[model samples]
Target: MAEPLLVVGLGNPGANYARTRHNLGFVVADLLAARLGAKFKAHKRSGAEVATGRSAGRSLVLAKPRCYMNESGRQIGPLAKFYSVAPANIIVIHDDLDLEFGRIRLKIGGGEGGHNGLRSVVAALGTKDFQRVRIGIGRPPGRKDPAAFVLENFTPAERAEVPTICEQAADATELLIEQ
Candidate 1:
């Protein structure tokens, strides 16, 4: 079996942000928790809700930061040390503006690609060796501001496609640990 792993999904906290493009990571994380039959609860020692369990004969920890996306590292960095998980065994899930919708990709360390949450994690962790599962939300429309675009709810048509993409991302997330 592989080593224990830490999977963090990035997003803003609260109901208002739920279903927004930026919170795609959180949604995927929730799905992974369900697949593992684990429930998330407030983490007394970290700034996130956490679920711990075993899957495929390996230990797993699923996390969602209580704080907003940009400061996610503040919660995750310590949590990693606490769990004794190294960067190689840590996976981050987030929405990607670079890829068009319907694309789900896995990458292991390179750039943050102008993602603030990713930047924060690099800063707090002092490394970029972790893995990433990027769920495409597509780029903003012509001249549309990215900040506003990510925060806005998905269009009706786009929302219709969510369940499948989320499932794909969650599947991609699990595949990484099998290595």
Candidate 2:
């Protein structure tokens, strides 16, 4: 049972979303790829960027869906099918609004908690059996529309800790895959 596992970072595809709070998935995924010494390559067919590497002798495929946040499954589901990754072996790294900043929470087979990206993934895969490595970005301040807030870049104060936060999230991801 040495099949490679799939790790998907959910985000809107493009340079603009790269620094947004919603793109926490990509930041963490990129950090994980660096730790594994992997570089991502374009997978136009699946509309995903993929990186392959090993850790603790286990093969891994890290992916970033190259599409809008709400349409993540458009790429991830097909990519998973192409890689033959089991629903159980798929881990989704995404930002969470409920938890405090930098907090890490792991869950499986749960509802999307009002997240459009997670909802899309669940719909595409037709199952809620995958894992979620949620990185808390905290709820937006001053009652801003959560949707708009997510797409905005992290606050200046939070930016200072963003790197460390991403690194910790990446470490947690490694633990899940390594185990």
Candidate 3:
């Protein structure tokens, strides 16, 4: 059998984080889980809700770390070890401030580019070899602080297209895994 592909969606837990730019990964994960009919169950290593199964002919483990975004590596490191998956077999889905809203980029072994979640994961895994699916949430308009910007709810205009972007990210993830 092929080794399971690890799909980690980086975000904070709790309803309050819902719809925030930083929690876009969690939003997309929920959508993916709903589409797969996968139930969320707690996992010891990551303190996360995980769903394991197959998609697009690839065995998959979908994980959402329950910890804060900055400490995500604490969860993902152990989960990766437990699953015996190398960095190359792991894919992280996350939001990016540098890209325009609704854009998607796929890349591997690059720098974290100042994303706390990706930074933590890279620190824990001790390498930058994993693939990442970057969903563009874009920078805050005007003088808004980036930290505050990410935590704020989307504007009325953004609310319309965010779901489609999330779904598109999920689909991109599935395709990357199946390759």
Candidate 4:
């Protein structure tokens, strides 16, 4: 059997940011937990909400950091250590501004691409040797700033597609584990 995987979904905590583009990670994590019949509870050692279950017959640990996006590593790193998961077995699901909305990309060991959440994780882990499931939100429209765009809720049209995107992301996560 493989070592248990630590899956960290990056996003801000709280209902205020729940529907924003930046929270796509959390949305996907919720769906994954639901599929596994797992419920998230506060984890003091990790400073995050964590749930454990089996997916694709593999043990899984899902986490959502309670801290803001930029400080994700503060919690994720400890969780990985506590769970005895190596960086290679850690998967991070986060929003990607570089790709179009509804797109999904999976990669291992890469640059942060200006994502503060990823940057923090890399710094904390002291390596870029982990997997990432990038959920695309695309660049801001017109002259809108990227930071502002991420913080704002998706438009009504975009809102309709959120569930589908999350479902795809969740599927991708499962595939990653199975592989």
Best by lDDT: 4
Candidate that beats the other on lDDT, 2 or 4, i.e. the better one:
4
lDDT tens digits by residue: candidate 3, 84-157: 98988998999898889899999998777668999999999999999999999887878897878888888899
**Per-model CA lDDT versus the true structure:** 0.89, 0.90, 0.87, 0.92
- Model 4: runs farther than 4 Å from truth? none
What residue runs in model 2 are displaced by over 4 Å at the alpha carbon?
Answer: none
Q: Candidate 1 residues 1-179, lDDT tens each?
A: 55679999999988899989989999999999999899999886776899988766789999998988889999999888888889878899999999998699899898886678899888888899999998888989987788889999999999999999999898888777666
Instruction: Please list the residue runs of candidate 3 whose C-alpha ends up more than 4 Å from where it truly belongs after superposition.
Output: none
Better of 1 and 4 by TM-score: 4
Q: Which regions of candidate 1 deviate over 4 angstroms?
A: none
TM-score of each: 0.96, 0.96, 0.95, 0.97
Q: State the local distance difference test value for candidate 4.
A: 0.92
Candidate 4 versus the native: TM-score? Answer: 0.97
Q: Between candidates 2 and 4, name the one with more favorable TM-score.
A: 4
What's model 1's lDDT at 82?
A: 82
What is the C-alpha local distance difference test score of candidate 3? 0.87
Instruction: Report the lDDT tens digits of candidate 2 across residue range 71-121.
Output: 998899999988899888999999999889999989888878678999999
